[PDB]
């Protein structure tokens, strides 16, 4: 789920080999002598083989568990990562690493052989043999790791999308305006240059409407493309429109701009309307009779709603945003507080007690020159948080103000003043 | 952690010393000299009781 | 973390392997197990702590749904001689135990009997769930 970023780095084969073997040469001891006991020599080389095995399987386990299971996640993420990374290659590489995690077999076999070593040379050659077979296995992992590091960097940079949240797609032709709609409606770092596939990916933005988080999704582009041939950039848009439970806003841009004709726009709309069968569609015109017939074209679809507006004005934008949110929430609650009251128990009156001071009072503007000092700043003036000694007095209310810096005696000879202290 | 003999912590302390602490350390010296001189003058006054 | 304030020092009464009382009606009666968070590391020394200290524990007596299950929570009474930095030495009738999550939030909703002043000042939700302080 949602930001598979915590994947440790996948080093290439040679670097991984250098790491795991230098760790063995460094951590485990390096000195033994022929005059030592054969048991000591055996334990030495056994420890080396076992540590070398454990390093490789720790590394491989960090790859296998950190990477996601492309099946078993969500169909939307599955299809997205399939069109990005070629699911077959993905699974094949990870299976290669799993079967290499073989190293265990080599370690066990060669340790059990080392139990019968009758000489330093024999034990040394067996150790060398185990580590060399490990090295061969890893040398045969040169390409999958290169693939997987790249997939790691990409899948870390992918955005976190919840498919079940209140969503709205922003669709249209290339070079329409649907991306700087996202720019204007929402915080998002997206490019708006005038050419077709300026964006090659999905971009996400969030906003809050009616005390509810929504997410808008800008999608790079779709072409008319008879659909048994299309690229991995448009299949992102298609899978996003198909999977998610959103509203969807098709931007038409009724104008000679766009480098695209209105006939082609309505053609694409009629091409991709089968995805729209349950998706709460709206059309927005961003500023002759056949061109208008082409609009009742699309109005004749059963569930649709047309709007005219601009990126020139910034209120129609919020207008149409709220329209899309309202269209969604209704059949959300379809697909899916009690305040109590007294009942008249008595006549005793109750009323809010508020002094005139707060009603005569002025709010606090944090960016006015002439304002209240607010002891934060008196602290800043005298000395910081941990040094400023506030006087708990200077606030107190007395008959005489000259006695500010007085003290009350607490104890006399044996007695306590607070016990004897009455007014009378 | 940062050790006692860490250069950065010692530089920060060096910057603090010249300010709010040396003023308090220097005031006490003038106070105590003013007391030291009076403890001489009172002994002279007692010597001049004879 | 989870606690509000500094690591303050009050004497140690509750080493590892100590069964102390739970009096809330979450279901437990007893708390035993190993661990103390913020404990040092010294050869041959026992992990033992208080100061509203958080500890790992199991129900030795209670409901089976929460027996067999390790859980964090906080000392509220000790029965050792503790010193207040304001005067006198304090001590309780007994040890007391009781249950929470790692953020300091309680599985139960009310506490019986007194709870330590410094324990309540250090753990907010204990102060909200406690009706009796000292």
């Amino acid at each position: 789920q949602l930001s598979w970023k915590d994947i440790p780095t996948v080093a290439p084969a040679n670097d991984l080999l250098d790491i795991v073997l230098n760790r063995t040469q460094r951590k485990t001891p390096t000195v033994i002598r022929p005059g030592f006991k054969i048991t000591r020599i055996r334990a030495f080389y056994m420890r080396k083989v076992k540590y070398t095995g454990e390093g490789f399987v720790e590394k491989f386990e960090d790859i296998l568990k950190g990477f996601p299971n492309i099946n078993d996640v969500h169909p939307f993420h599955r299809d997205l990562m399939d069109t990005l990374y070629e699911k077959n290659h993905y699974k094949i590489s990870l299976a290669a690493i799993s079967r290499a995690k073989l190293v265990e077999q080599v370690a066990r076999d060669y340790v059990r052989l080392l139990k019968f070593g009758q000489s330093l040379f024999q034990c040394k050659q067996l150790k060398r043999a185990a580590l060399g077979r490990m090295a061969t296995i890893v040398k045969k992992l040169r390409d999958p790791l290169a693939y997987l590091e790249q997939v790691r960097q990409h899948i870390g940079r992918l955005p976190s999308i919840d498919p079940n949240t209140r969503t709205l797609l922003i669709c249209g032709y290339p070079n329409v305006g649907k991306s700087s709609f996202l720019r204007c409606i929402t915080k998002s770092d997206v490019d708006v240059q005038p050419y077709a596939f300026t964006t090659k990916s999905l971009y996400v933005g969030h906003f809050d409407y009616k005390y509810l988080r929504f997410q808008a999704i800008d999608t790079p582009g779709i072409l008319d493309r008879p659909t048994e041939e299309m690229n991995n950039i448009e299949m992102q848009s298609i899978y996003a429109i198909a999977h998610l439970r959103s509203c969807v806003l098709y931007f038409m841009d009724l104008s000679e701009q766009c480098g695209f004709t209105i006939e082609a726009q309505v053609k694409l709309f009629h091409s991709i309307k089968p995805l729209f069968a349950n998706k709460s569609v709206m059309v927005v015109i961003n500023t002759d009779e056949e061109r208008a017939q082409l609009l009742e074209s699309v109005k004749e679809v059963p569930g649709v709603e047309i709007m005219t507006s601009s990126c020139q004005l910034e209120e129609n934008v919020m207008e149409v945003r709220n329209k899309a949110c309202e269209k969604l929430l209704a059949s959300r609650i379809e697909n899916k507080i009690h305040v109590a009251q007294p009942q008249a128990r008595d006549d005793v009156k109750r009323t809010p007690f508020i002094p005139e001071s707060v009603k005569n009072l002025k709010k606090y503007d944090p960016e006015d020159p002439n304002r209240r000092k607010l002891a934060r700043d008196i602290e800043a003036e005298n000395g910081g948080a941990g040094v400023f000694n506030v006087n708990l007095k200077d606030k107190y209310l007395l008959e005489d103000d000259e006695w500010k810096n007085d003290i009350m005696p607490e104890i006399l000879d044996g007695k306590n003043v607070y016990d004897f202290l009455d007014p009378e | 952690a940062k050790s006692l003999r860490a250069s950065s912590h010692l530089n920060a302390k060096s910057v603090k010393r010249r300010g709010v602490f040396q003023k308090a350390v220097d005031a006490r010296e003038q106070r105590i000299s003013d007391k030291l001189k009076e403890d001489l003058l009172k002994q002279k006054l007692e010597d001049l009781k004879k | 973390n989870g606690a509000q304030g500094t690591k303050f020092r009050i004497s140690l009464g509750l080493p590892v392997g100590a069964i102390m009382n739970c009096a809330d009606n979450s279901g437990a009666r007893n708390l035993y197990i190993i661990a103390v968070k913020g404990s040092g590391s010294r050869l041959n020394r026992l992990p033992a702590a208080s100061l509203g200290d958080m500890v790992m524990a199991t129900v030795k007596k209670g409901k089976p749904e929460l027996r067999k299950k390790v859980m964090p929570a906080i000392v509220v009474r000790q029965a050792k001689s503790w010193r207040r930095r304001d005067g006198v030495f304090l001590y309780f009738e007994d040890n007391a135990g009781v249950i929470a999550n790692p953020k300091g939030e309680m599985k139960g909703s009310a506490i019986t009997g007194p709870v330590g002043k410094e324990c309540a000042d250090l753990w907010p939700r204990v102060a909200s769930n406690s009706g009796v302080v000292v």
Binding site: D109, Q118, A129, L158 | - | -
Partner: protein, 225 residues
């Protein structure tokens, strides 16, 4: 996040003020620092540095070579004694083969001998009772399959061993089934689909082991065609 955000950031703001000068200066100082690392880096790091540098030299030599160069028998008899590929192998002492094993509380009886090297026992082995067994052939030093190479075809196969016919050391060792260097074994060859004139499938052939498998867990061998 969300996409190539740093590439966007570099397009919008751009990398630093002091980026290109510093990169140029790093590339310039690398010539000094390479030699600095050579005269320093004592030990394994210097050894590896030298290895890397030698490999890099060879790569560039081959690259320049490729640049500048890119600027009698018939086909069927091309590609073409009965002595085995390993006569006169090192001789093994009985002491180096058999380890002494001692039995009793006060170990005073020895009479038992453990074979230290890899072995082939058979298909129906079924260990002898302890009071009656003298020769011990441990389970870890027991091979069923070898790695047999055909000299022709440049191909190897993991074949099951069928027997041991001749270990050149003391033919007792043949009956024990000791797979020392130079040992001759029968291996199955049904995987290769060999057939004699007449149509009878061959499923057994002689091979000679080329390694000392007491040092390597592998039993590597060469077919005798």
């Amino acid at each position: 996040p969300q996409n190539d955000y740093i590439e966007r950031h570099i397009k919008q703001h751009g990398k630093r003020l002091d980026h290109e000068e510093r990169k140029r200066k790093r590339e310039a100082r690398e010539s000094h620092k390479i030699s600095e690392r050579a005269q320093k880096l004592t030990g394994w790091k210097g050894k590896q540095f030298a290895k890397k540098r030698y490999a890099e030299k060879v790569s560039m030599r081959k690259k320049i070579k490729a640049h500048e160069q890119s600027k009698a028998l018939p086909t069927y008899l091309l590609d073409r004694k009965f002595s085995v590929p390993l006569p006169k192998v090192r001789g093994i002492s009985e002491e180096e083969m058999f380890k002494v094993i001692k039995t009793g509380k006060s170990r005073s009886k020895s009479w038992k001998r453990m074979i230290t090297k890899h072995t082939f026992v058979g298909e129906g082995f079924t260990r002898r009772p302890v009071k009656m067994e003298r020769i011990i052939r441990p389970s870890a030093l027991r091979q069923k399959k070898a790695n047999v190479t055909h000299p022709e075809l440049g191909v190897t196969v993991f074949l099951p061993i069928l027997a041991v016919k001749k270990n050149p050391q003391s033919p007792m060792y043949t009956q024990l089934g000791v797979l020392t260097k130079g040992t001759i074994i029968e291996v199955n060859v049904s995987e290769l689909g060999m057939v004699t004139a007449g149509g009878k499938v061959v499923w057994g052939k002689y091979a000679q082991v080329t390694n000392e498998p007491d040092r390597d867990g592998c039993v590597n061998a060469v077919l005798l065609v």
